[PDB]
C-alpha cells in the first residue's frame, strides 16, 4: 500500500461479554464488546431470551371451565 496514509493493522483481541476472546487483527489491539456470535440469541440456536411465552393468547384463558353445562 501507499505509505503513511493507512492505519497500521496489528494482532488484536476483541473481548466479549460472555468472556469469549476473538483472535483477529485491527487498528486497536484490545477491544471489549457487549455481544458476539457465541452468545447472541439469534445466533445461539434460538435462545428464547425472555419471551418463551407461546403467544400466549387467545385460548390461553381456561379461567375456567367451571361455567355450566
Amino acid at each position: 500500500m501507499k505509505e503513511g496514509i493507512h492505519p497500521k493493522l496489528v494482532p488484536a483481541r476483541i473481548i466479549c461479554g460472555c468472556g469469549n476472546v476473538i483472535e483477529t487483527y485491527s487498528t486497536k489491539p484490545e477491544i471489549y464488546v457487549e455481544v458476539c456470535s457465541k452468545c447472541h440469541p439469534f445466533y445461539t440456536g434460538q435462545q428464547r431470551f425472555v419471551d418463551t411465552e407461546g403467544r400466549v393468547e387467545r385460548f390461553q384463558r381456561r379461567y375456567g371451565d367451571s361455567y355450566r353445562k
Binding site: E57, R58, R61, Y63, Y67, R68
Partner: protein, 83 residues
C-alpha cells in the same frame, strides 16, 4: 374488569343456544341482545347478529376474539367524519 374471583360472564340463555347448535349440527344466525356477554371458546365458528340499539350486526367469531364482549364487534355510533 370483572373480578377473577367470580365467573366468566355469559347470559346463560345465550350460552344455552350455542351448545344446542354444536350438538344438533351447526349453524345459523343468532339474534341476541347480549352485548354484555363474553365471547367464548364454544362460540367460535358461528355468526351472531348482535343488536346495537338499532340493528343486528352479522358477526363472524374467530379464535383471536375470544376474551372480548359481543358489543365491541357491533358498533353503537354512526360516524363518517366531519364536514
Amino acid at each position: 374488569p370483572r373480578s377473577l374471583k367470580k365467573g366468566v360472564f355469559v347470559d346463560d340463555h345465550l350460552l344455552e343456544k350455542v351448545l344446542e347448535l354444536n350438538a344438533k349440527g351447526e349453524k345459523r344466525l343468532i339474534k341476541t341482545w347480549s352485548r354484555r356477554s363474553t365471547i367464548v371458546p364454544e362460540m367460535v365458528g358461528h355468526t351472531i347478529a348482535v343488536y346495537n340499539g338499532k340493528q343486528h350486526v352479522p358477526v363472524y367469531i374467530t379464535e383471536n376474539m375470544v376474551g372480548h364482549k359481543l358489543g365491541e364487534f357491533a358498533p353503537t355510533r354512526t360516524y363518517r367524519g366531519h364536514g
